[PDB]
Design a protein around this ligand. Sequence first.
Ligand SMILES: [Ca+2]
Ligand SMILES: [Ca+2]
Ligand SMILES: [Ca+2]
Ligand SMILES: [Ca+2]
Ligand SMILES: [Ca+2]
Ligand SMILES: [Ca+2]
Ligand SMILES: [Ca+2]
Ligand SMILES: [Ca+2]
Ligand SMILES: [Ca+2]
Ligand SMILES: [Ca+2]
Ligand SMILES: [Ca+2]
Ligand SMILES: [Ca+2]
Ligand SMILES: [Ca+2]
Ligand SMILES: [Ca+2]
Ligand SMILES: [Ca+2]
Ligand SMILES: [Ca+2]
Ligand SMILES: [Ca+2]
Ligand SMILES: [Ca+2]
Ligand SMILES: [Ca+2]
Ligand SMILES: [Ca+2]
Ligand SMILES: [Ca+2]
Ligand SMILES: [Ca+2]
Ligand SMILES: [Ca+2]
Ligand SMILES: [Ca+2]
Ligand SMILES: [Ca+2]
Ligand SMILES: [Ca+2]
Ligand SMILES: [Ca+2]
Ligand SMILES: [Ca+2]
Ligand SMILES: [Ca+2]
Ligand SMILES: [Ca+2]
Ligand SMILES: [Cl-]
Ligand SMILES: [Cl-]
Ligand SMILES: [Cl-]
Ligand SMILES: [Cl-]
Ligand SMILES: [Cl-]
Ligand SMILES: [Cl-]
Ligand SMILES: [Cl-]
Ligand SMILES: [Cl-]
Ligand SMILES: [Cl-]
Ligand SMILES: [Cl-]
Ligand SMILES: [Cl-]
Ligand SMILES: [Cl-]
Ligand SMILES: [Cl-]
Ligand SMILES: [Cl-]
Ligand SMILES: [Cl-]
Ligand SMILES: [Cl-]
Ligand SMILES: [Cl-]
Ligand SMILES: [Cl-]
Ligand code: NA
Ligand code: NA
Ligand code: NA
Ligand code: NA
Ligand code: NA
Ligand code: NA
Lengths: 175, 175, 175, 175, 175, 175
Amino acid sequence: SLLNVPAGKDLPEDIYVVIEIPANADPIKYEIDKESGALFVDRFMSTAMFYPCNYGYINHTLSLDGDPVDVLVPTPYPLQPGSVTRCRPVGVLKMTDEAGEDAKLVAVPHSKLSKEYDHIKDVNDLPELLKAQIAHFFEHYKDLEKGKWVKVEGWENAEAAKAEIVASFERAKNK
Amino acid sequence: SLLNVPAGKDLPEDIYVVIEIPANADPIKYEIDKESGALFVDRFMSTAMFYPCNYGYINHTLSLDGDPVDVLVPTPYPLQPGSVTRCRPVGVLKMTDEAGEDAKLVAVPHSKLSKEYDHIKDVNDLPELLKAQIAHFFEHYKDLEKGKWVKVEGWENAEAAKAEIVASFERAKNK
Amino acid sequence: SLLNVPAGKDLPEDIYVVIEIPANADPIKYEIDKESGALFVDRFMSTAMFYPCNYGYINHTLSLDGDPVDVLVPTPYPLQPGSVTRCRPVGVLKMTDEAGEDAKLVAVPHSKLSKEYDHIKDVNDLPELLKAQIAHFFEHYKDLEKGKWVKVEGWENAEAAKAEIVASFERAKNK
Amino acid sequence: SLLNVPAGKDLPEDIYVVIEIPANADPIKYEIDKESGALFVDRFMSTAMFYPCNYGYINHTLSLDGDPVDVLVPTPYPLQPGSVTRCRPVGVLKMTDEAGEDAKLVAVPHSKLSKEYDHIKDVNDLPELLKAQIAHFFEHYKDLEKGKWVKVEGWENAEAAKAEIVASFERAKNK
Amino acid sequence: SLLNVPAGKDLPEDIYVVIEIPANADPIKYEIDKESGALFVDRFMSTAMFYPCNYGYINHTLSLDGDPVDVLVPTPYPLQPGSVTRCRPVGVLKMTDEAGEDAKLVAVPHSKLSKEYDHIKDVNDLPELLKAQIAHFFEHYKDLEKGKWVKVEGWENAEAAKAEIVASFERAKNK
Amino acid sequence: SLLNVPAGKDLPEDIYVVIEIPANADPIKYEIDKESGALFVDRFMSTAMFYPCNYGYINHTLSLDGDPVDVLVPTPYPLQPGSVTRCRPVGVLKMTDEAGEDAKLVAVPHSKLSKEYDHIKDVNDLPELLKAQIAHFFEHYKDLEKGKWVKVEGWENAEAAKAEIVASFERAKNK
Ligand SMILES: [Ca+2]
Ligand SMILES: [Ca+2]
Ligand SMILES: [Ca+2]
Ligand SMILES: [Ca+2]
Ligand SMILES: [Ca+2]
Ligand SMILES: [Ca+2]
Ligand SMILES: [Ca+2]
Ligand SMILES: [Ca+2]
Ligand SMILES: [Ca+2]
Ligand SMILES: [Ca+2]
Ligand SMILES: [Ca+2]
Ligand SMILES: [Ca+2]
Ligand SMILES: [Ca+2]
Ligand SMILES: [Ca+2]
Ligand SMILES: [Ca+2]
Ligand SMILES: [Ca+2]
Ligand SMILES: [Ca+2]
Ligand SMILES: [Ca+2]
Ligand SMILES: [Ca+2]
Ligand SMILES: [Ca+2]
Ligand SMILES: [Ca+2]
Ligand SMILES: [Ca+2]
Ligand SMILES: [Ca+2]
Ligand SMILES: [Ca+2]
Ligand SMILES: [Ca+2]
Ligand SMILES: [Ca+2]
Ligand SMILES: [Ca+2]
Ligand SMILES: [Ca+2]
Ligand SMILES: [Ca+2]
Ligand SMILES: [Ca+2]
Ligand SMILES: [Cl-]
Ligand SMILES: [Cl-]
Ligand SMILES: [Cl-]
Ligand SMILES: [Cl-]
Ligand SMILES: [Cl-]
Ligand SMILES: [Cl-]
Ligand SMILES: [Cl-]
Ligand SMILES: [Cl-]
Ligand SMILES: [Cl-]
Ligand SMILES: [Cl-]
Ligand SMILES: [Cl-]
Ligand SMILES: [Cl-]
Ligand SMILES: [Cl-]
Ligand SMILES: [Cl-]
Ligand SMILES: [Cl-]
Ligand SMILES: [Cl-]
Ligand SMILES: [Cl-]
Ligand SMILES: [Cl-]
Ligand code: NA
Ligand code: NA
Ligand code: NA
Ligand code: NA
Ligand code: NA
Ligand code: NA
């Protein structure tokens, strides 16, 4: 099932991301259920916003927030919910929510899937417009949901992203 | 797998529906296979009709027709086949087919997913147009399939819907 | 051409809206060009937001901002850019932008097109979620465009909407 | 504008059809307005049905019902509303509605656009499933609209279709 | 899971195909992973081409190339990735790639799903345009991927397709 | 109508392109008719290929092939057929077809529509993958259409593109 997919072929540079929400999609927040492996509806979003990239997680990781590491994956065409993509981390957006710190990584399709993103090596290589759009999304998408809130802090580099992956992989392994 | 998803967090008011057919979709009737959990094509429909809401079933239920309880779920945007949505029953359409009685429940997204449908408490609160469209769909979608037929009987209330859920949950539990 | 379509069969209660941007669409702001009648791209929006309803204008009207009256039209399914829909005003959102006051009307499909929206008679009958989503959209969609900004003021009723239509129709007639 | 497009390069075998409603579309009945050339919404259909082929009319024709000849055009992919396709008539479905007789022609893409439909020479060459789906659509799509109704009579051949085209072209020419 | 679906109810005439890539889709080559049953991205294709039919495989088969038998399934509407369709083989396209011979079967929806394809009994009954489009796709889709290449050889009949199914089913059974 | 749209606000650097075919679309080749301004179907393409960018022309230009200048416009989201986009030329692909030389320009959305493409100043700044995909498309899309053929020659720079625009604008002006 999706529950058995590796974290990656060679973490932290070569990872797999399980997609929950496609790019360019309707505002339905899906989440894989840890017990069943099934895709559940978490929310029908109240804001007229959409996730700016495909969105999902790295299996077999455990962040300090109790969930697997969250990742945004830009692609040329939107991915299927429940599919798995090989990727390479390039940066991370830090933010604070009602529960504490959080982080949203950005990882690009691995070179074996396409050469398209090979030129993006670190966070400064992501388009400025894309980074601004991502920050604005996380800052505002919960504006109409009482109880949940997000304050965006700022971007960090690929080494910071990779550190989150390794820390969270080792935490899961040792759980 | 989808085979392991609960009937609901607190039946009959708080249920899960496993979606087989999205709203606003092409006329492909999908059904989850009980053995494998996979989504199979049942039919490429002959009529130029579409399911009027997302359509699926309540897992771990057994109706007198030998299948899990059938449910229609209105949503703001169409759901993914194979996804699971938390919902609240509000009414039921009774009908007769080539095999006997049947029923098609209507359940709305649970308040935790969105406040949108909180105002729909019972069958009289569903829009008249939606109810008429649903009845017309079930009356006619099999008009060109020899062997299968449906005669729509009429709507009943949320208590009737809830009774079907409980009866069919207890039948499954006791199988 | 679109340039020759009436303001309405019986203003201000029975109007036509020329659609520029569909509901549930990609974030491309289109505008009809007054000279040619053609649909031009105004902007590829920087924010990950979408217009919450179909959006367009009432032909043969002139508001104090120099443009025809702006209208949002909820529909069951998204409309085609460049199409024309008969509608009935129900409310108006007032706002301030870099140039001055503005207003975004809401008008629902006319009863002759469908009975669906007949129950919405005034602004209090629009769903609260929809109104909040609309306000949030206009408050934030220009957050990443330097030079353009919007501060949302608040909703007014169908009589206020109708007054804007009549004032702007008479201004155009007298230009 | 669309108002100036010919009936055809060589009627009745080689015609142009102005498309109003795409195949595989949402249930929005569009109609071109004779005065403006603009695409208007006629109806948001109440039934959960869709037009089985692209649907439109032959310009510069006048049938006994006061409108241009109505035509269904099967294509491999859905057409744009307002576009024009070169086609060849192959058959006609006769029907009675609240106003009198009507007819819905079927015309296939001309050989110059594609060889795909060259094998369909007459009404017996259309797939049986397609013909049944078309008849069922026209029989039922107005089932929930009070005031409008349709009783389907039966299919006739390409010569019958061609006769309707010629009669209606000559009626328009002589208006 | 998808891993447990039969090869077919009555091979080689009555088979199941697990769909990986829908018809009319974006150029994302998906493949089910043998270990997990999950849908992985194999490639973001470099060419502006799309798979001409739905594409997938027959479970519990093993061809000489080490993978299950590959099958193209024409349908009236595109299928969901990960869904399963009952079908009937009608022909096979032979080709050579960087690793050796290959074959791409064509199988049509089984009569129980629809009567639409019952008239296609053998390879000569497939439309010429469809066969040419399929051959051209496989000849060119890898033109921009270094390392992978395809030279199309030619079509063979339903008996040849059926022989591949049986040989590959027996090879798997005996592994 | 579309017939009255300028070539551009300040040719050759600041042009308008009238879109005929969206990005990421079905394989339907549309062309605006010079007489009517309407969008006609030219071809239902036989190959399983799609135009790699939005495609259209510069109005009020006349190339040596008798038609307005042809332009590809990359955008973040596909454009509407018949819409008009302000753009800036960056390069040109030269090719030979059954009638003689041809050229396909590439122009990016103007800075006023978005900052996204400001970094693309000349042909070397276009992604290599995109350029290869475009060349491969034009080399192969007519492979199954008898009578029409294309041999791709190679790319030239923004000055070459601009020269084509000016030459063809002056030819039209002087017709
Ligand atoms: Ca979308
Ligand atoms: Ca998560
Ligand atoms: Ca969080
Ligand atoms: Ca997290
Ligand atoms: Ca915030
Ligand atoms: Ca649909
Ligand atoms: Ca069922
Ligand atoms: Ca039944
Ligand atoms: Ca049942
Ligand atoms: Ca019936
Ligand atoms: Ca959308
Ligand atoms: Ca405006
Ligand atoms: Ca303004
Ligand atoms: Ca205004
Ligand atoms: Ca603001
Ligand atoms: Ca559709
Ligand atoms: Ca008509
Ligand atoms: Ca009629
Ligand atoms: Ca008629
Ligand atoms: Ca009838
Ligand atoms: Ca497509
Ligand atoms: Ca395979
Ligand atoms: Ca191979
Ligand atoms: Ca193979
Ligand atoms: Ca080759
Ligand atoms: Ca597409
Ligand atoms: Ca051209
Ligand atoms: Ca040419
Ligand atoms: Ca040219
Ligand atoms: Ca060539
Ligand atoms: Cl792992
Ligand atoms: Cl993306
Ligand atoms: Cl990589
Ligand atoms: Cl349970
Ligand atoms: Cl729905
Ligand atoms: Cl609830
Ligand atoms: Cl007027
Ligand atoms: Cl809407
Ligand atoms: Cl009204
Ligand atoms: Cl004419
Ligand atoms: Cl069609
Ligand atoms: Cl022909
Ligand atoms: Cl088996
Ligand atoms: Cl297909
Ligand atoms: Cl069969
Ligand atoms: Cl000009
Ligand atoms: Cl593009
Ligand atoms: Cl510019
Ligand atoms: Na909030
Ligand atoms: Na039947
Ligand atoms: Na701004
Ligand atoms: Na009726
Ligand atoms: Na290659
Ligand atoms: Na050719």
